[model samples]
Target chain A: EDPNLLFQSYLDNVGVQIVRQMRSGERFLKIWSQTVEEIVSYVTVNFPNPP
Target chain B: EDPNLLFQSYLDNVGVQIVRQMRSGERFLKIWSQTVEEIVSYVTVNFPNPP
Candidate 1:
């Protein structure tokens, strides 16, 4: 899908695509396991809900 | 909100708290930008587009 897609509208589509693109179970797990490191940092720093 | 918040059910709530904590208008925007980014990452990973 297009990167121009709005977060709310295209979020689901984009997420599924990325998951599908990953080659292996390990790769999926690798991406999955980042739980509280980079993700947590990124969340604490920037990401928040729309007001 | 509580840390016990579940990512799926409590995502909206947890997201709200983080956004609320940022101080100052400028600081809020700074965090707002990053906050959005982190949310995207989390949703992509641990947060899934629920089936």
Candidate 2:
């Protein structure tokens, strides 16, 4: 699978699901299993490549 | 520094900054170097952690 595609699907699938979870009152950590630190790092690392 | 605090600052810092760039007509890629896909991913990855 294309990394970008996989990333996109995760956002569309799990990412949105997690937000729904957040809206529902679940903790962010419980929902995503990662920290913003990791998220930002991932973004920072793979930026400049078209989203 | 606290992971949460670091996260909070970036959201306050880069997240908001990216939004501004988007408002200014920069491509989300050129602006944040990621897509709404990644943005959504990041947001979901850390939600109830509290913004």
> Which stretches of model 2 miss by more than 4 angstroms?
A1-51, B34-51
Output the lDDT of residue B13, model 1. 47
lDDT of 1 by residue, A1-51 (tens): 422134533334434443454444434334433322333443333334322
DockQ of each: 0.04, 0.07
- Worst lDDT 10-window in candidate 1 chain B: B1-10
lDDT of each: 0.41, 0.49
Measured over the true interface residues after superposition, the C-alpha RMSD of each candidate is 13.9, 13.1
Candidate whose lDDT is highest: 2
The collision pairs in model 2 are none
lDDT of 1 by residue, B1-51 (tens): 232234433444443444356322334334445555665555555432332
Deviation in angstroms for A9 in model 1? 7.8
Against the true structure, what is every candidate's RMSD?
Answer: 16.4, 11.7
Best by DockQ: 2
lDDT of 2 by residue, A1-51 (tens): 354554455445544554566678886445434534555565445433222
